[PDB]
Amino acid sequence: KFTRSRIPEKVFQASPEDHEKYGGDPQNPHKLHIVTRIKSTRRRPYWEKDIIKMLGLEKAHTPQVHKNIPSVNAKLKVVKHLIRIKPLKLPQGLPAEENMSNTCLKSTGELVVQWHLKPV
Amino acid sequence: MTGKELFEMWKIINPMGLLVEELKKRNVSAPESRLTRQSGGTTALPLYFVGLYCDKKLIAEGPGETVLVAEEEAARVALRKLYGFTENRRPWNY
Amino acid sequence: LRNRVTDRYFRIQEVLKHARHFRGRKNRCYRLAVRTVIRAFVKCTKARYLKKKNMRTLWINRITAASQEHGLKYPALIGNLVKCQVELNRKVLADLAIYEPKTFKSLAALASRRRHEGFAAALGDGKEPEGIFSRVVQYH
Amino acid sequence: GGQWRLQQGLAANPSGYGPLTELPDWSYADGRPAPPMKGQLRRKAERETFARRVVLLSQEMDAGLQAWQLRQQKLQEEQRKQEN
Amino acid sequence: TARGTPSRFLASVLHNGLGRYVQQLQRLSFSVSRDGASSRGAREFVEREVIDFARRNPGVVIYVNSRPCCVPRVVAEYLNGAVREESIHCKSVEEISTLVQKLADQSGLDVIRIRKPFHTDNPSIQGQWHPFTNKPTTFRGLRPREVQ
Amino acid sequence: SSFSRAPQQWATFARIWYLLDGKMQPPGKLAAMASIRLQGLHKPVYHALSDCGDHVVIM
Amino acid sequence: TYSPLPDDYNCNVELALTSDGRTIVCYHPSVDIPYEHTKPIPREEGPMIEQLSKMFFTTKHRWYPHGRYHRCRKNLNPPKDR
Amino acid sequence: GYVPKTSLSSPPWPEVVLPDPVEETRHHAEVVKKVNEMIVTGQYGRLFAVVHFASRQWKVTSEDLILIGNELDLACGERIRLEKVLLVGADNFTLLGKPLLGKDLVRVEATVIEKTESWPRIIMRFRKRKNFKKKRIVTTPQTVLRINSIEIAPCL
Amino acid sequence: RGRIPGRQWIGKHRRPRFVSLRAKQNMIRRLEIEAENHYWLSMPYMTREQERGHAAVRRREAFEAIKAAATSKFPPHRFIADQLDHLNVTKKWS
Ligand SMILES: [Mg+2]
């Protein structure tokens, strides 16, 4: 019978080669995930549909910010084959109330807090 | 006159004669008709690009179905260029 | 016959007016005209997607024609223009090809220039100076 | 060619974020700026909500870490106090 | 449908924008009724909005005729001779105002399918493409396989 | 440019004569070139309803 | 000596970048045809349809007439652009 | 690493040598100066422009008409400046933005000639053998603009 | 000639299906994306104990808002102005 899949824990234990490849240090892990649904929930189990709805990824190619905490990670593990997960990067730090209206999420995963739309 | 053509507005006869007269006034050698390009010469739908050369310098060229029509149209094009009413001329300023 | 329909003429005409330009009895008989008109309206609704698709296909075909005239292929031209950071769309590119042949020749020359710059970069892979046109303007 | 745009850091779709779309489409001939476009206003609202959620999530996680640290303290000095 | 409807090309009445913009609407005839719930909105429009609209659009003559009517109407006559008749029957003041403003801003050209979203009288500046563009010329104009 | 309407239209929608030499050439590649030219797909003004085909002579 | 495209046909393309590098300039003056590249000006229904087809390199089908239905469906006042 | 000349020893395509960056930049500057002098002397007639308006790119010239598929919240006869000009071109030269040309370089001005509603479009949904039939009529607002002028300034 | 018995793609004797290089590349691309997803999920920020209860207040407040919305459902107000405005249907001139 087709059932929910239990991913072995060793799958989510990064190696030094993976760290070098993906540019993420095991120490000081990133705080937030940018998650984009890149796959349809159609032809997938109702539990995956429900997990996608819970994560708020109903619209495809629409980035959503989530906490990098074990429970959210468990949900993302459940629906990992339908989503792209990247680390949210804050080159200028967290946006402040002053610049809250000038933010933009660049394709690189960086949430720049100044968006002038002018050449550098 | 926006979108209108010089000779659509000003009907003329013998554009080759007009061009010859204008070039004489401007002290330019009489134009020489020349067959720059041709296609399907022996068919019922030929194309003839005929150019007018003064001192071996192209002043204009025109397409046509027959050689005579191509030459006449090239004369019209040369007249348009000389009078400065070319299609790509500066648009009227409002 | 307490209540009877008196507008049936106009109710029929509302469909026959759209059916007038059909063939055969489909333009005269309501039992047939209604079916044909419903099919025609469904086709008209579904034809907008096909109109956009065919417009893009025609633009791609014309751009391919012009690029071949200039010795380039459509994929090369489009990709290298994108790399040059010129965001002209296919409609405008086809319009330029038809009506501004010299501008399209300039664009094709630019695309080939960027293509050759990319080839040179790949061949001499390393920290060699970036191609003049290869340089990308950065916006912040 | 969206892969090249992604590599350069721009949006894969040129219709995405960038000057080509986020700049005003027009302005009065006198030079007065045009009223903000509806799409641009909606996009700015969406980015503002995204930034506010980012701040909220980061603050919540930081507060949770601080609370956990404080609880570990409480436990440690308690244990010590009833040990003494 | 497009095939079952006439079509035209995008155009202006007299190149309306080149020299100066001219409001194409010239006449607005409001047939209204003193009595009748259908023309309540028309009556309120005549009371509160028609004067402001008239002074805003000095180039449009507005004829308000109050006569027994079951369907109050507005007839817009444009410079090009077009006449468009609209029913303001059981329409609120806001609806009538929007309709009148749309008529004022609209040209007299028929509201039919427009083949092209653009119209250029000078489409080419560099010369319209022909097969002999982008074709090199040969010495003495010799066609292929010509001997001399 | 600066042509009259009818001559300009004639020049644009004129049919050109192309020559292919099939000596030791693959018939498929010859056919590809000939079909492109015959359909007029090599013209930027191409359209299936424009009858913009060109003559192809294969020797 | 490098040229992205041959300059023997159509305009002579010259590409450039402004000093800031934020805009490409293209100089493309048209090329005139050399005088040496030019030549001096020279100085029944069935059979009818076959002759017309031979003349215009078409098929016989288009030269046959059409019925009144199609003839009167044809629009005699088509919209004109430019 | 020598390889004798065979059909596959070398790539089929010809080998291209790009100009050296220094001399090529000098040539770039010379060409830019030439085109700038052309602009200064006004050696151009009609100018066309690829301009990004609404969501599309229009190839435009003076006296042209453009049909935007929406209301623009502008009174008819009001003058506007189209700011997103991707390309400006003349008979002999063209300027390309990366991706947009400068305001100081190009000024495209239009006028809101007309505000209209599109001809009624029918949206018909039908599914066979399901009693599923629906009809809707939609009239999209539209604005016709006339492009008064396209001006360039010597700012290269 | 060359018949597939019954219906294609379902029976015991189905029409053969072959994977193209395009499909292989697509699947490989998706696999790469999912491998990166594994990497980025392999580094949690907080532990389960650390996260325990860190959003309880916000979740409770959100549910309280939901409950308030659910329990505030109650018929809308009715106005004498609304009732009397209907008399305007017979509003006339003089
Ligand atoms: Mg079967």
- Three-class secondary structure of residue C17 per DSSP: helix
Is omega for the bond preceding H19 within 30 degrees of 0, making it cis? no
CA–centroid distance, B19 to ligand 1, in Å, is: 76
The number of distinct structural domains making up chain E is 1
Which residues on neighbouring strands pair with residue H123, listed in sequence order?
H136
Pick the closest to residue E120 from E6, E8, E10, E18 (CA basis).
E10
| A32 contact D CB<8A | yes
* H and G in touch (3+ CB pairs within 8 angstroms): yes
Q: How big is the A-D interface in CB pairs under 8 Å?
A: 60
Q: Are B60 and B81 in contact (CB under 8 A)?
A: yes
Interface test with A, best of D50, D53, D61, D68 (most A CBs within 10 A): D50
Which residue of C lies nearest to H16 if distances are taken between CA atoms? C116
Q: What residues of chain D lie within 8 A of the CB of C139, using their CB?
A: 10, 18-19
Tell me the residue range of the domain where C109 lies: 1-140
| E136 contact F CB<8A | no
Shortest Cα–Cα distance, I53 to chain D (Å)? 8
Tell me how far apart the alpha carbons of residues G30 and G12 are, in angstroms, rounded to a whole number.
6
Q: Are C120 and C131 in contact (CB under 8 A)?
A: yes
Tell me how far apart the alpha carbons of residues G74 and H45 are, in angstroms, rounded to a whole number.
41
Q: Are A78 and A47 in contact (CB under 8 A)?
A: yes
CA–centroid distance, I5 to ligand 1, in Å, is: 6
Q: Is the four-CA dihedral E146, F1, F3, F4 of positive or negative sign?
A: positive
Q: What residues of chain E lie within 8 A of the CB of H80, using their CB?
A: none
| B2 contact F CB<8A | no
Provide the 10 A C-beta neighbour count for residue A32: 24
CA–centroid distance, E53 to ligand 1, in Å, is: 71
Tell me how far apart the alpha carbons of residues F33 and F20 are, in angstroms, rounded to a whole number.
9
Q: What residues of chain H lie within 8 A of the CB of E57, using their CB?
A: none
* B and I in touch (3+ CB pairs within 8 angstroms): no
CA–centroid distance, A100 to ligand 1, in Å, is: 62
| H19 contact E CB<8A | no
Q: What residues of chain F lie within 8 A of the CB of E129, using their CB?
A: 12, 43-45
Q: Resolution of this PDB entry, in A?
A: 2.6
CA–centroid distance, I1 to ligand 1, in Å, is: 13
Residue E43's region, left for phi above 0, alpha for psi from -120 to 50, else beta, is alpha
Tell me how far apart the alpha carbons of residues C57 and C65 are, in angstroms, rounded to a whole number.
12
Of G13, G22, G73, the CB nearest to C109: G13
Q: Are A106 and A112 in contact (CB under 8 A)?
A: yes
| I33 contact D CB<8A | no
Q: What angle do CA C3, C4, C9 make, to 5 degrees?
A: 155
Strand E7-8 relative to strand E113-114: parallel, antiparallel, unpaired? parallel
Q: Are G24 and H96 in contact (CB under 8 A)?
A: yes
**Token pair 């005699």 in the structure block, residue:** G76
- Three-class secondary structure of residue D32 per DSSP: coil
Which residues on neighbouring strands pair with residue F58, listed in sequence order?
F20
Pick the closest to residue E44 from E111, E119, E95, E113 (CA basis).
E95
Determine whether the interchain pair G27/H93 forms a contact, defined as Cβ–Cβ distance below 8 Å.
yes
Determine whether the interchain pair C61/F46 forms a contact, defined as Cβ–Cβ distance below 8 Å.
yes
Amino acid at the residue I82: D
CA–centroid distance, C43 to ligand 1, in Å, is: 30
C32 token code pair = 């047939």
Of B3, B35, B88, the CB nearest to E125: B88
Q: Is E50 exposed, middle or buried (0-12, 13-18, 19+ CB in 10 A)?
A: buried
CA–centroid distance, E9 to ligand 1, in Å, is: 51
Q: What residues of chain F lie within 8 A of the CB of E133, using their CB?
A: none
Tell me how far apart the alpha carbons of residues I85 and E14 are, in angstroms, rounded to a whole number.
48
Which residue of G lies nearest to B57 if distances are taken between CA atoms? G35
Determine whether the interchain pair D64/I58 forms a contact, defined as Cβ–Cβ distance below 8 Å.
no
Q: Is G62 exposed, middle or buried (0-12, 13-18, 19+ CB in 10 A)?
A: exposed
Q: Are E74 and E83 in contact (CB under 8 A)?
A: no
| C86 contact D CB<8A | no
DSSP C64-114: HHHHHHTT--HHHHHHHHHHHT----HHHHHHHHHH-HHHHHHHHHHHHHH
Tell me how far apart the alpha carbons of residues H121 and E113 are, in angstroms, rounded to a whole number.
9
CA–centroid distance, I18 to ligand 1, in Å, is: 20
Tell me how far apart the alpha carbons of residues H35 and H31 are, in angstroms, rounded to a whole number.
6
Tell me how far apart the alpha carbons of residues A68 and B8 are, in angstroms, rounded to a whole number.
74
Provide the 10 A C-beta neighbour count for residue G8: 11
For residue D7, the Cα-to-chain-centroid distance in whole angstroms is 22
The number of distinct structural domains making up chain C is 1
The number of distinct structural domains making up chain A is 1
Interface test with H, best of E18, E53, E113, E125 (most H CBs within 10 A): E125
For residue E133, the Cα-to-chain-centroid distance in whole angstroms is 39
Determine whether the interchain pair C139/D18 forms a contact, defined as Cβ–Cβ distance below 8 Å.
yes
Determine whether the interchain pair H16/G2 forms a contact, defined as Cβ–Cβ distance below 8 Å.
yes
Q: For chain E, how far is it from start to end, CA to CA, in angstroms?
A: 60
Q: Is the four-CA dihedral D6, D7, D9, D14 of positive or negative sign?
A: negative
Tell me how far apart the alpha carbons of residues E112 and H119 are, in angstroms, rounded to a whole number.
5
Which residue of C lies nearest to G73 if distances are taken between CA atoms? C21
Q: Which chains touch F (3 or more CB pairs under 8 A)?
A: B, C, E
Which residue of H lies nearest to B88 if distances are taken between CA atoms? H46
Tell me how far apart the alpha carbons of residues G31 and G14 are, in angstroms, rounded to a whole number.
13
DSSP H41-86: HT-----EEEEEETTEEEEEETT-EEEESS--S--TT-EEEE--EE
Shortest Cα–Cα distance, E58 to chain I (Å)? 27
Give the helix, strand, coil percentages of chain B, each rounded to 5. Answer: 35, 25, 40
Of E127, E129, E132, the CB nearest to F45: E129
CA–centroid distance, I22 to ligand 1, in Å, is: 28
Which residues on neighbouring strands pair with residue F5, listed in sequence order?
none
| D29 contact H CB<8A | yes
Contact residues for E72 (Cβ-Cβ < 8 A; gap 6+): E30, E31, E32, E33, E36, E38, E39, E42, E87, E88, E89
Determine whether the interchain pair D55/A69 forms a contact, defined as Cβ–Cβ distance below 8 Å.
no
Shortest Cα–Cα distance, C112 to chain G (Å)? 6
Determine whether the interchain pair B36/G37 forms a contact, defined as Cβ–Cβ distance below 8 Å.
yes
Residues of I with CB under 8 A from a CB of A: 33-34, 36-48, 51
Tell me how far apart the alpha carbons of residues E131 and F5 are, in angstroms, rounded to a whole number.
16
Of C87, C92, C107, the CB nearest to H99: C87
The structure was resolved experimentally with cryo-EM
Tell me the residue range of the domain where A101 lies: 1-117
Determine whether the interchain pair G82/E115 forms a contact, defined as Cβ–Cβ distance below 8 Å.
no
Helix (H) or strand (E) holding D22: helix D19-22
Q: What residues of chain H lie within 8 A of the CB of B93, using their CB?
A: 149
- Three-class secondary structure of residue B50 per DSSP: strand
Q: Are B30 and B20 in contact (CB under 8 A)?
A: yes
For position E129, which CATH number holds? 3.40.30.10
Q: Which chains touch I (3 or more CB pairs under 8 A)?
A: A, D, E
Q: What residues of chain E lie within 8 A of the CB of C27, using their CB?
A: none
B9 token code pair = 């507005």
According to DSSP, residue G36 is labeled G
Tell me how far apart the alpha carbons of residues C106 and C66 are, in angstroms, rounded to a whole number.
12
Tell me how far apart the alpha carbons of residues I43 and D1 are, in angstroms, rounded to a whole number.
33
| I44 contact D CB<8A | no
Q: Which of residues 86-105 of H touch E (CB under 8 A)?
A: 89-91
Residue B3's region, left for phi above 0, alpha for psi from -120 to 50, else beta, is left
Determine whether the interchain pair C139/A114 forms a contact, defined as Cβ–Cβ distance below 8 Å.
no
